[model samples]
Target: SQYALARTFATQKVSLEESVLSQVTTAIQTAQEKIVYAGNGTLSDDDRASLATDLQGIRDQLMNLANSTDGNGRYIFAGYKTEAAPFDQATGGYHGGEKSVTQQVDSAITLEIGHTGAQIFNSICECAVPEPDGSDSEKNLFVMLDTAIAALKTPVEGNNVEKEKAAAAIDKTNRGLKNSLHNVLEVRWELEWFLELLSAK
Candidate 1:
């Protein structure tokens, strides 16, 4: 009886996570649309500013999703620290513990029921801009959006240096967004597989 109960809970949690990941993908895709427009070197400053506002809205949506809670009012993405929210809205830093929350579904099977926000949002993307020394720099989802938004807001009209800098930042951010979406899709696929296994059990 208890084993059945455990399986039910695991399935529900994983299903919820899968839904959230789907929403995350949508948010990233919306941001990508604005980013592509921002990348146009000939775009007017007013157009860039409008795109920046749209990107800011998308970031806020992502932040709220990152702090999603379970049915018991605990944060789903908080890892071991479920009582508190995982990602800080101001700094976009993860405050959750390193390890995921796991559940024993049966006598021998243990599965992760919760994933940390850092694992999803802060994963490194190799497609991000490299450092001056040509080393790969760490780029996370939130940081990429923030950098792109800032680049869009910066005035580039008739300023060659600023134009080049903004263009580079936007291009790098577009690459990072693609990689981030891939990461989220991979996580969603794993969750789906986990759900399949749970259903079989």
Candidate 2:
């Protein structure tokens, strides 16, 4: 019965894990949209600020829905790392705890799995930004959104709050876009290597 139970659990686990993995693709997709069509993707100051707000909203929604868990407490995306929340939002920022959270649902079959929020959401090569002086910018998506939202709320235009906010938001949006592009680029390359390493077998 234990064998039967394990097998049953394995099937369910696989299904749930696959679901979790599949859902993460949506976050990546939305990120792409924000990077390409939102702020940095904007055509004007007003448009940039508006797009940043919109993208921030989208990201907020996406963060809440990324995980796929089983009927039991096991984290679907965590291979064997099933105890803790796969993605920690308690701190208000995505700190990819462990991408090596993969586990073997079927030990005899040697099915290995696991992923990290960093690798999934933040690890893109395109996400990297070299400073204007040709150094690397340390900010990531999390910082961008946090700053952009607050910047949009500021009163900068000498009582023409919207205008002033819009102007600053414009820079924020462009920087956000450029930053997003850098992240996306890095992620693309990371994904490439992620797939490439699998070929060594």
Candidate 3:
């Protein structure tokens, strides 16, 4: 009975994590498409504004996913602080703890039942430029989306400098998005593997 209960709990946690990760995958892909469309060098202010709106919607969707909860209403990505939400909607900052939520699935096996928001969303882009102080430009997933949206909303028409700035912003965000997607997929794969292990037991 003890083993059965442990297995059930582990299954529930893994299933919820997998479900949220799948939704995140779709959201990232959609955002990538909009970012790619905005990459057109000759886009007008209207075109950029339209893309910005689309990206903003996707970002909001992602925030909701980031705050996904399990059957017990505990935030799966909140690490040890599962009772509260992990990501702040207004600031797009991670408020979760650093450690993963763990469960003893068996006498000999203690498994990580869930990943933290920081693990999933706080990836630093390798292609990001260094700061003036020679520090790495550390932009999280939400910040990257916000930066791209802001760039798209900025009026770039009839001004070469603004045009160039927008272009650069789009390029940087494109690279950052790729990195973020890769990190997310990696986490998804890990979760899938964990699920397989649990099922095999």
Candidate 4:
């Protein structure tokens, strides 16, 4: 009876943990696709406003996933604050703490169920320069996507040199998005590997 109890507990813990990770993984994967769509082309199209609207739409959906729950109202990656919503809906603000939560998956081993929402959703490998106030702004995936959208919205109505500069800015922002997407993919891979290990246990 004692061993059976342990087995049942392990099953429940692993099931919940895997479900949380699976949701986060799928969310990020979808976000990756959205970024790829935004970064797929040069900024030479005349109807850039339409593209900007598309980018904004994609950005909103990605943010929704960032604030998603683990099917039980707990923020899937909200670190230790499972009850609180991690990312604000309108402002994209992070309200969850960075502390992690753990579950005993076995008699001799514990596994982490919580992850920093910012690190998983907002990571930025390349960032803008320091701000005018001498403070650095958070250069997250959201920022990168917003930057891409802004560049798309700007009409190519300037002189040749000015148009070149705007296009270059868009290119750089797309590069930043690529880096951000790369990081998300890596995080998803690691999460998947962890779930695999849990399944084996």
On TM-score, the leading prediction is 1
Candidate 1 collision pairs = none
CA shift of 115, model 1, Å: 0.7
Candidate 2 least-lDDT 10 residues: 103-112
Q: What TM-score does model 1 achieve against the real structure?
A: 0.92
Q: What is the per-residue lDDT of model 1 for residues 1-201, given as tens digits with 9 covering 90 to 100?
A: 368988998998999999988999999999998888887788998999899999999999999999998778988888889888888888789989899878899888898878889888988543444455575654568898999899988989999999999998888888788888877888887898889889999
Report the candidate with higher TM-score, 1 versus 4.
Answer: 1
Pick out the ten consecutive residues of candidate 4 with the lowest summed lDDT: 124-133
- State, as a TM-score between 0 and 1, how close model 2 is to the true structure: 0.51
* Per-residue lDDT value at 187 in model 3: 79
Winner by lDDT between candidate 2 and candidate 1: 1
TM per candidate: 0.92, 0.51, 0.90, 0.69
lDDT string for model 4 (84-178, tens) is 77887765667786776665656676655455777766665443343335544444666766766777677666457756765665665555555
Question: Per-model C-alpha lDDT, please?
Answer: 0.86, 0.49, 0.85, 0.61
RMSD of each: 2.2, 6.6, 2.7, 5.2
User: What is candidate 4's local distance difference test score?
Assistant: 0.61
Error of 1 at 180 (Å): 0.8
| lDDT per residue (tens digit) for residues 1-201 in model 3 | 377888888888888888898999899899999999999988889989999999999999999999987777888888899888989998789989898888887778888888889888887434444544564555588988999999999998899999998888787778777878878888777788878888987
TM-score of 3: 0.90
Q: Spell out the clash pairs found in candidate 4.
A: none
Clashing pairs in 3: none
| Model 2 ranges with Cα > 4 A deviation | 1-53, 66-68, 76-81, 88-91, 94-99, 102-112, 126-129, 138-140, 158-201
- Model 1 misplacement above 4 A: 125-133
